[PDB]
Amino acid sequence: EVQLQQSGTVLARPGASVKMSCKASGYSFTSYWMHWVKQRPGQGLEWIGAVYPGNSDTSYNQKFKGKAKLTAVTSASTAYMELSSLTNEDSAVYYCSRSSLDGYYVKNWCFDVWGQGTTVTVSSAKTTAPSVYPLAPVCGDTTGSSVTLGCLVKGYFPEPVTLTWNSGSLSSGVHTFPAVLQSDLYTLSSSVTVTSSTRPSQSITCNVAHPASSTKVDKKIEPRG
Amino acid sequence: FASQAVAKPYFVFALILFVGQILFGLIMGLQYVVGDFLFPAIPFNVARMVHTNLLIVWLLFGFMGAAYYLVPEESDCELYSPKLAWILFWVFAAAGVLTILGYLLVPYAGLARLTGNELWPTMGREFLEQPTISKAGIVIVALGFLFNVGMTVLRGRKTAISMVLMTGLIGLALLFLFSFYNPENLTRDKFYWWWVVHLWVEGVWELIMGAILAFVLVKITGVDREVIEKWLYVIIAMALISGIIGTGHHYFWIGVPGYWLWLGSVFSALEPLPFFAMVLFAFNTINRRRRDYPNRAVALWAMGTTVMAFLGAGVWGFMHTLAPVNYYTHGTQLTAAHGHMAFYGAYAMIVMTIISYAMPRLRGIGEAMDNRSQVLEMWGFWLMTVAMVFITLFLSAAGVLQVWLQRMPADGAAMTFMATQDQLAIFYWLREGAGVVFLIGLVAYLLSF
Amino acid sequence: DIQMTQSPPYLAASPGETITINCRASKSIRKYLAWYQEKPGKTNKLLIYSGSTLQFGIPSRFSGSGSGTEFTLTISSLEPEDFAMYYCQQHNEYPLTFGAGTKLELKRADAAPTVSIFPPSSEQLTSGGASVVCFLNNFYPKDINVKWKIDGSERQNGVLNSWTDQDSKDSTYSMSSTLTLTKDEYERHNSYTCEATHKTSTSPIVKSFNRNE
Amino acid sequence: FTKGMARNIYFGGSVFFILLFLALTYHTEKTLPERTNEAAMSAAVVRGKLVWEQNNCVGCHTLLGEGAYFAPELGNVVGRRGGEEGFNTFLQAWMKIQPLNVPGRRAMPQFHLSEGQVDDLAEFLKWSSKIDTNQWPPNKEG
Ligand code: HEC
Ligand code: HEM
Ligand code: HEM
Ligand SMILES: CCCCCCCCCCS[C@@H]1O[C@H](CO)[C@@H](O[C@H]2O[C@H](CO)[C@@H](O)[C@H](O)[C@H]2O)[C@H](O)[C@H]1O
Ligand SMILES: CCCCCCCCCCS[C@@H]1O[C@H](CO)[C@@H](O[C@H]2O[C@H](CO)[C@@H](O)[C@H](O)[C@H]2O)[C@H](O)[C@H]1O
Ligand SMILES: [C-]#N
Ligand SMILES: [Ca+2]
Ligand SMILES: [Fe+3]
């Protein structure tokens, strides 16, 4: 099975450099162009360039001649991309992919296998644990047949955070929203909906882990009074 | 003798076909690097069967031509039938030109339906791509031809030369019968395929070539017939003692028992010897010429044939004939290299050699041509011959890189077929250049007449 | 560079139906257009190349057509797994370029959002901040307008929204809207209101609270 | 050393080695049932051999390393294209999609083969891959 394994998320400061890898298996590494492709959020795929490991030749989109450097090490079947003078605009997912056809002269073709992507996050921010605030329904509006509770997670960097409700046993009727940037830092929220006999007679607790700051916090949702 | 004149249509047609062979060679050589050239009109395989069948057919025409010329002289009488020699000429020429046109004018599978291949399926094997009716028509021509020349030997003086030639000619036709045998088991099919190709080219055809060489040396050198014919028997003895078990060098990887690895390797290792003896033969009996000869080109043709046959069949043959090596080189540009040099050096060259002796005294011009004509022939000789060594060096370099990139490394490390061919590109451009110099040689040779 | 524009950018459809989607090149790419399927948690999958050649293993319900400048992709009878993002890529010239995508979505019945509003938590208040949160949950289709009002006045600044993707189980959408204030600015006003406007109703769903209640 | 001597070396050499050769080919031909696994040589593989011939695949490809050198070795292709399980299915696609039309690339023809024909091809090639060939080719690239 042809497979491409890409390296993990990298964080860097503006003006720095980053180098990522793509490990090929299940085919003749030296016989196929390896391509690299950029994707920023809601922004459309962009071909950066490619490397032919059979002779070390490279080809670069003119828009990335300055930015990207491509290499391959054939004993290891791994290709590499180094991005330099980083900028917020280089924050993206970066994919490697294999030409569907073998050989040197098929430089411009389509691809039959892609890597899962490597995230590059370019920021000046500092590792910061979130604050976690419980969100209880409006004072005395315990009214309908179902009730909605929430958890606000504010002021963290980097992604990600994982959020659960009652250590994971409460999992249906949950919405956990993608994080957004407020200035340099990320915030997200999650809601959980539950029948009004479920609570506040039973306990509902928000659990938030931020591996990057080794934080785990619990916030019990308490009725307002 | 006057019935020696029927050889002329044979040598002319053979040379016309030889031109066609080179053009289709050049088309394929471009297809190697511009892969869609002339596609889909003339796909590479169609171009290839034109190239390889034009090679076998033009050489066959040269052989019959050669037999028609020297058999009368050896036998010391007129040929059994000039009108037969001419009827057979047009039948063979029309059958050849017909089967070639079928190749080019109808998709192969269509030509197969159209000629009723399904009743007797012999088509689509290498060198044997001609419809079964084309093969049948070749057998009938070969029977006629053998009767014609064989009757002439019967009522006439027997010589060793002429009897070795006839033995070779008969053997050729006989072995050709195996092209009608197409087993259903692939290994069995390959096993018997080589009774055509190998027992021809390293067996029976070596009787033909040697007989032609010996005759030309008898006529050119004035050295004793008795010594020439002794060495002829030594040379063909060595041909068959090495060559017959020798077939085994084609039996390494087709699915037959591994004893052929040993047998094939050991006897094939000795198959250079006859080509080496043919160089000691031509050089020594030209060195010992009791008299000079007006046509000094033939002497060159005869010396060169033996060196090239030896380089191509002997040295390149040997370089890949040992199983431990063939394991890696089997089915590779090395094979193409050896095959080009060997077919040219042995067989194309011996036909041009006998043409060089016989053409003047057939157009009733004399022993030799004027001195302008003779410098051209020699130019065409060096140009063709030198070009061919370069064709074989460039393909040998391709073959070495192919083996390194594709055949030696393990799975994962080895480069795919298609990718390794892109890596060989330069060598293929260079070959195609050499191929051009060769045509310029064939044209220069042709402008000698 | 050859530019590619795919249309439409979003298409809703149902299982068993047929759709066809478009790809246009800004200059001729002869016949050399490929298509990829993108799905969350999966690597991109080649569907078609050279305009109409199906990639090995791809079901025949997919097909494509076109040359020069205008190309299409068709799926004959949509299957659950076919709802996904689709990209085209030109493979006639350097530099390779791609279209920005057509997202093929699962149609379901219209549903109004369930809306809830949450005052700042007291914990956040003691630190000097005030976030008012609004959830608009389980709605379809995806278009929706949220409006904040403070004491009856529309408030535009300090609002961040986030939207889930189509839920793989019930096919709805959800959204949060968070108005972030200073405690001080929070304390100047009384009445906080979140209003959602959605095609299921010509009148907005209004949820609010009074800071002292 | 005389002519007559040389002619008898030629005569005796050729008869003896001709007979040695025939005896070896008798033996060899006894081993072929097991070597080639003739047990599996189905009507389908034998029909595939016919479509291999009728369309001259060997005019561009090698099979057990014999044939032409324009295109790849097909004796072991079955092992580079999803094995036993999925190779037939691969081949159907592969024959339909030709020619690939990649500019400047070596091109294979469209043979407009029926599905039965291609399936017979696939069996022939599968079966061919399993002939005991003394471990030829060296690796999966042929
Ligand atoms: C020359 C005109 C060809 C003929 C006749 C056949 N093939 Fe072919 N084939 C040819 C080329 C140049 C290629 C390379 C394709 C590429 O672009 O990479 C091929 C390829 C194949 C393959 C794939 C081999 C691989 O290693 O992946 C197969 C299985 C194949 N061809 C089969 C095949 C058959 C069965 C043929 C006779 C019907 C045949 N080919 C003819 C060139 C030519
Ligand atoms: C003039 C005599 C010969 C000529 C015309 C000739 C021609 C050729 C040709 C055309 C092929 C390729 C056949 C194919 O299509 O499979 C070939 C293969 C081969 N020849 Fe010869 N040959 C001759 C003599 C020899 C000699 C004398 C030897 C040994 C010294 C030799 C050893 C080989 C072997 C080992 C191969 C197979 C290579 C492979 O495995 O890829 N040949 N020859
Ligand atoms: C311009 C000169 C020539 C060119 C460019 C040329 C080209 C070629 C090519 C490209 C092949 C096909 C190889 C493949 O299968 O990939 C071939 C086959 C062949 N040619 Fe030529 N050729 C030329 C001249 C000759 C001459 C003069 C001879 C006579 C010796 C010759 C003999 C053969 C043989 C025997 C085959 C089959 C080789 C084999 O299968 O191993 N060719 N030729
Ligand atoms: C004068 C020389 C005469 C030698 C005659 C006898 C020759 C028999 C020797 C075996 S022929 C052939 O050789 C191969 C090794 O070269 C052998 O390959 C071996 O190693 C390979 C890795 O390189 C590997 O791919 C094979 O699976 C492994 O078997 C091969 O089996 C053998 O048949
Ligand atoms: C004119 C001469 C033409 C040139 C071609 C002749 C080359 C034949 C000599 C073969 S040397 C042979 O190389 C083999 C293949 O690499 C080597 O194979 C080995 O390493 C392999 C990994 O590469 C691996 O599959 C096995 O562990 C092992 O078999 C082998 O050591 C070496 O003898
Ligand atoms: C060599 N035949
Ligand atoms: Ca061949
Ligand atoms: Fe041989």
DSSP B353-373: HHHHHHTGGGTTS-SS--HHH
Is-cis flag, bond preceding B43, omega within 30? no
Instruction: Calculate how far, in angstroms, residue B313's C-alpha sits from the geometric centre of ligand 3.
Output: 15
CB count within 10 Å of CB B404 equals: 15
List of chains touching D (3+ CB pairs within 8 A): A, B, C
Q: Is D6 on the interface with B (CB under 8 A)?
A: yes
Q: Which residues of D touch C53 (CB under 8 A)?
A: 97, 100
Query: Are residues C65 and C119 part of one domain?
Result: no
Rounded distance, CA C140 to CA C143, Å? 8
Domain count, chain C: 2
- Shared domain for C200 and C117, answered yes or no, is yes
User: Do the first three CATH levels of A1-124 and A125-222 match, i.e. the same topology?
Assistant: yes
Spatial distance between the Cα atoms of B440 and B375, rounded to a whole number of angstroms? 15
Kindly state whether residues C194 and C121 are assigned to the same domain.
yes
**CATH number assigned to the domain comprising residue C147:** 2.60.40.10
The token duo for B11 is 């040598």
Residue from the list C50, C54, C56 with its beta carbon closest to the beta carbon of D101: C50
C61 SS3 class = coil
Ligand 8 centroid to residue D38 C-alpha, Å = 27
The Å distance, Cα B418 to ligand 6 centre, comes to 26
May I ask the CATH class of domain A125-222? mainly beta
Number of structural domains found in chain B: 1
Does C131 lie in the same domain as C87? no
On chain C, the residues whose CB falls within 8 A of the CB of A179 are 162
- Residue type at B339 in one-letter notation: G
Please tell me whether residues C135 and C69 are part of one structural domain.
Answer: no
**Structural domain count, chain D:** 1
Q: Token match 């490397």: residue?
A: A51
- Give the CA distances from residue B145 to residues B213, C52, C189, in Å, rounded to whole numbers and listed in that order: 21, 57, 118
Contact B186 D103 (CB under 8 A): no
CATH tag, A1-124: 2.60.40.10
Using CA atoms, how far residue B398 sits from A106, B428, C62, in Å, is: 21, 8, 43
Atom 1 (ligand 6) nearest CA? B198
Q: What is the C-alpha separation between D123 and D45, in angstroms, rounded?
A: 5
Query: How was this entry determined?
Result: X-ray
What's the CATH number where D90 sits?
Answer: 1.10.760.10
Q: Any idea how long chain D is?
A: 142
Q: In the sheet that C62-67 helps form, which strands lie side by side, from edge to edge?
A: C4-7, C19-25, C70-75, C62-67
**Same domain for C98 and C131:** no
Q: Is B398 in the pocket of ligand 3 (CB under 6 A)?
A: no
Residue D59 has what DSSP assignment? G
Q: How far is CA C73 from the centre of its chain?
A: 21
Helix (H), strand (E) at residue C211: none
The ligand that comes nearest to the alpha carbon of residue B338 is 2
Cβ partners under 8 Å of residue B365, min gap 6: none
Domain end residue (candidates: C81, C108, C135):
C108
Provide the residue ranges of all domains of chain A, joining segments of one domain with +: 1-124, 125-222
Q: Is residue C22 within 8 Å of residue C66, measured between CB atoms?
A: no
B275: domain CATH number is 1.20.210.10
Q: Assess whether C99 and C121 both reside in one domain.
A: no
Domain containing C169: what range?
109-211
Which residues, 6 or more positions from C110, have their beta carbon under 8 angstroms from its beta carbon?
C140, C141, C199, C200
Nearest chain D CA: its distance from C167 CA (Å): 35
Nearest to B164 by CA among B174, B175, B155, B153: B153
Instruction: Tell which one of B395, B408, B415, B420 to mutate to probe ligand 5, the residue whose CB is within 8 A of the most ligand atoms.
Output: B408
Helix (H, G, I), strand (E, B) or coil at B285: helix
Angle among Cα A135, A139, A140 to the nearest 5 degrees reads 125
How far apart, in whole angstroms, are the C-alpha atoms of residue A64 and residue A90? Answer: 11
Please choose, from the candidates A193, A141, A163, the residue with its C-alpha nearest in 3D space to the C-alpha of residue C138: A193
Provide CB contacts within 8 A for B394, sequence distance 6+.
B427, B428, B430, B431, B434
- Judge residue B111's burial from the number of C-beta atoms within 10 Å of its C-beta, 0-12 exposed, 13-18 middle, 19 or more buried: buried
